[PDB]
Design a protein around this ligand. Structure first.
Ligand SMILES: Cn1ncc2ncnc(NS(=O)(=O)Cc3ccc(CC#N)cc3)c21
Length: 167
């Protein structure tokens, strides 16, 4: 028994809620919140900018030090950094951005990172400003992640469409 509330059950291990991931993080303070990162960990907009703003830019400061030491992530890759005031840890995961020509087949590799964590609060990878088909992202999530994932999807029209079209 964990502290996530009002999530709707999709499968044995995947749950979904119509919510802003930052609001969920601040209320739950989960062990792991997933960021929809890019390879440079430049958190300007979308999930990354919303989370970073909620940390008062501390996420960006930590991320810049990480990149200066380690170089960029891979598309499909991830790193674990602090969750600051939102979570114990933030798992920064790079989904393919279809707006930059990045291979959609890398979405499965991106979701595989979630399997290294028993429970995660996460957004729908490559959705919204990343330009991928969201029904597709949810399908890949369900078929790839085996650990317990709590999805927060800001868009009500997206949330209703995702639930009502789910197979
Ligand atoms: C950006 N942002 N900020 C907080 C937060 N929490 C959960 N989801 C987010 N965005 S999202 O993952 O891309 C899901 C999403 C949101 C909106 C749309 C509209 C279109 N078309 C499509 C898809 C969030």
């Amino acid at each position: 028994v964990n502290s996530f509330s009002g999530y709707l059950k999709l499968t044995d291990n995947v749950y979904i809620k119509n919510a802003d991931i930052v609001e969920e993080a601040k209320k739950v303070k989960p062990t792991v919140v997933v960021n929809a990162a890019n390879v440079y960990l430049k958190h300007g907009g979308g999930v990354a900018g919303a989370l970073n703003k909620a940390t008062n830019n501390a996420m960006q400061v930590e991320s810049d030090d990480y990149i200066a030491t380690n170089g960029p992530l891979k598309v499909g890759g991830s790193c674990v950094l602090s969750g600051h005031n939102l979570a114990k840890h933030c798992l920064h995961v790079v989904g393919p951005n279809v707006n930059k020509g990045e291979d959609i087949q890398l979405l499965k590799s991106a979701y595989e990172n979630f399997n290294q964590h028993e429970v995660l609060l996460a957004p729908l990878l490559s959705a919204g400003i990343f330009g991928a088909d969201p029904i597709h992202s949810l399908r890949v999530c369900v078929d790839t992640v085996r650990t317990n994932v709590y999805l927060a999807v800001f868009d009500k029209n997206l949330y209703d469409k995702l639930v009502s079209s789910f197979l």
